[PDB]
Amino acid sequence: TCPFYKKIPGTGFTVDAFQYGVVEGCTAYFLTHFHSDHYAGLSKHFTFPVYCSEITGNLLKNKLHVQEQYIHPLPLDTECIVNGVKVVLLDANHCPGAVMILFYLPNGTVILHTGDFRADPSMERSLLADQKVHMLYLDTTYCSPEYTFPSQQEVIRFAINTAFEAVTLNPHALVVCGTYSIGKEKVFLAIADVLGSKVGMSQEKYKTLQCLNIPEINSLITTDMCSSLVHLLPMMQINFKGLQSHLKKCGGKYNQILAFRPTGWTHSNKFTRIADVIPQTKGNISIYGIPYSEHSSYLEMKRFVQWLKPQKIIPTVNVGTWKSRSTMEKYFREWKLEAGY
Ligand code: NI
Numbered sequence: 001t002c003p004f005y006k007k008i009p010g011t012g013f014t015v016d017a018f019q020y021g022v023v024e025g026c027t028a029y030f031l032t033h034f035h036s037d038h039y040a041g042l043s044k045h046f047t048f049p050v051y052c053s054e055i056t057g058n059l060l061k062n063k064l065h066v067q068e069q070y071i072h073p074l075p076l077d078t079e080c081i082v083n084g085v086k087v088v089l090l091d092a093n094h095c096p097g098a099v100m101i102l103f104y105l106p107n108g109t110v111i112l113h114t115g116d117f118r119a120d121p122s123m124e125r126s127l128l129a130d131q132k133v134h135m136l137y138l139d140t141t142y143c144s145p146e147y148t149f150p151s152q153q154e155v156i157r158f159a160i161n162t163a164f165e166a167v168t169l170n171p172h173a174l175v176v177c178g179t180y181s182i183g184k185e186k187v188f189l190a191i192a193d194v195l196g197s198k199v200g201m202s203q204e205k206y207k208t209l210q211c212l213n214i215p216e217i218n219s220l221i222t223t224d225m226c227s228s229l230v231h232l233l234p235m236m237q238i239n240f241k242g243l244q245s246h247l248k249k250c251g252g253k254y255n256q257i258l259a260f261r262p263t264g265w266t267h268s269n270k271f272t273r274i275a276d277v278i279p280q281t282k283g284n285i286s287i288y289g290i291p292y293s294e295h296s297s298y299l300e301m302k303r304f305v306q307w308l309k310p311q312k313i314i315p316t317v318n319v320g321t322w323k324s325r326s327t328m329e330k331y332f333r334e335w336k337l338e339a340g341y
Contacts, residue, residue: 001020002014002017002020002023003319005137005314005315005316005319007023008103008111008113009105009111010105010106010107010109011027011028011083011085011103011105012025012026012027012028012083013026013027013028013029013030013082013083013085013103014026014028014029014030015030015032015101015113015115015137016030016031016032016038016039016115017029018031018038018039018040018041018042018046019040019041020041026048027049027083028048028049028051028082028083029048029049029050029051030050030051030052030101030113031050031051031052031056031060032052032056032092032098032099032100032101032113032115032116033053033056033092033094033095033097033098033099033115033116034055034056034059034060034063034095034097034182035095035116035181035182035183036181038115038116039060039064042060042064042066043064043065043066044064044065044066044067046066046067046070047070048070049070049072050066050070050071050072051072051074051082051087052071052072052073052074052097052099053073053074053076053089053097053098053099054073054074054075054097054213055096055097055211055212055213056073056097056098056099057071057072057073058097058211058212058213059097059182059208059211062207062211063207063208063211074087074089075089076089076090076091076099077089077090077126077127084106085103085104085105085106086103086104087101087102087103087104088101088102088127089101089102090102090123090126090127090128091126092114092115092116092117092118093117093118093119093120093122093123093294094115094116094117094118094183094294094295095116095181095182095183095184095294096182096183096185096212096213096214097182097212098115098116098117099115100112100113100114100115100117101113101115102127102128102133109134109135110131110132110133110134110135111133111134111135111137112128112133112135112136112137112308112310113137113316114136114137114138114139114316115139116139116141116294116295117139117295117296118152118293118294118295118296118300119296119300119301119303119304120300121303123304124304124307128308133308133310134310134311134312135310135311135312135314136305136308136310136312136313136314137314137316138301138305138313138314138315138316139295139296139316139317140301140315140316140317140318140328141264141295141296141317141318142264142265142293142295142296142297142298142301143298143301143315143317143318143327143328143331144298144327144331145298146269146270146298147265147269147297147298148269148270148297148298148299149265149269149291149293149297150274150291152186152292152293154274155187155274155290155291155292156186156187156190156292158274158275158277158290159187159190159191159260159288159290160190160191160194162258162288163175163191163194163195163258164194164195166256166258167195167229167258170255170256172253172254172255172256173229173254173255173256173257173258174229174231174247174250174253174254174256174257174258175191175195175229175230175231175257175258175259175260176230176231176232176233176238176243176246176257176258176259176260177191177199177230177231177232177233177259177260177262178232178233178234178235178237178238178259178260178261178262179205179232179233179234179235180234180235180236182208182212183294184262184292184294185209185212185214186292187260187262187290187292188230188232188260189220191230191260192220192228192230193220195229195230197228197229197230198219198220198221198222198224198227198228198230199220199221199222199228199230199231199232200221200222200223200224200225200227200228200230200231200232201221201222201223201231201232202223202232203223205232206221206222206223209221225250226253229254231246233246235261238259238260238261238287239287240282240285240287243257243259243285243287244285247284247285255284256284256285257284257285257286258279258286258288259285259286259287259288260287260288260290261287261288261289261290262290262292263289263290263291263292264291264293264295265291265293266289266291268289269291274291277289277290302331302335305332305335306335306338306339309339309341313332315328
């Protein structure tokens with residue numbers, strides 16, 4: 001049944017709750033972003049109002065075939081009224097089209113639902129600065145102090161410099177980047193930019209990217225693999241067998257692969273700096289795991305919460321075990337005693 005952490009009290013609303021059938025008493029279904037564990041259940045047969053960003057609504061129409069009459073896109077950073085309740089959509093710094101949602105309840109309570117987010121100090125100057133938030137529905141994906149990772153900027157500088165050096169040393173090297181969802185487009189786009197190539201990809205992935213309102217996108221991507229020396233493949237194909245196979249397909253145009261796997265966290269992060277990352281190599285194939293995250297690190301999460309000073313926190317990730325729930329509740333209490341709220 002629908003978990004309580006997907007329901008907004010004092011409303012008929014739910015967030016990211018499309019796999020439970022008809023939720024009794026729900027008048028409006030919000031979708032924070034187009035990742036499968038959040039949209040699970042949606043299709044062309046859905047007939048309730050879906051409220052989302054413009055970019056998520058493009059993906060719902062083009063990829064899932066949801067009918068236009070049930071897609072209700074909202075502009076960001078704008079007070080809107082939905083079924084009698086004031087709401088605002090804010091940029092979540094996750095994947096394209098991802099939002100946080102501010103609910104202003106008729107009784108005076110203010111609720112922030114982060115969806116999935118990567119906390120940033122820029123959020124401290126949005127419309128969130130303008131009033132008090134009482135209850136926080138929080139993306140706790142990496143809520144433990146072991147989870148450190150570098151800035152997205154540091155990670156992209158590493159990838160650009162590695163790719164440019166390899167291809168200038170060997171103009172017959174191919175660059176391959178893994179994907180299984182939207183997000184992390186800077187990794188393959190920044191590398192294609194430094195190399196003077198478009199990124200080549202399947203027709204399915206090209207269709208997906210063309211929904212994302214990315215500026216000048218027709219100049220940066222293509223379905224013609226032969227004209228490209230940056231290829232995108234399913235994340236599943238980023239291993240030695242999959243890559244050896246791909247290289248056979250390119251008909252002796254290339255004699256080396258340099259591949260990137262943009263993982264979330266990996267335990268080489270508790271020890272190793274970005275400067276010190278090395279690949280796994282077999283023969284003429286090398287694979288780099290780069291820690292490019294679209295979720296908050298521990299410290300980023302803690303700073304955002306200590307700034308916001310909510311009265312109550314409701315975690316939305318890692319909720320399925322008692323040890324995980326009790327650990328998170330201990331960190332919330334530490335943060336509150338340190339900051340004095
Ligand atoms: Ni997500």
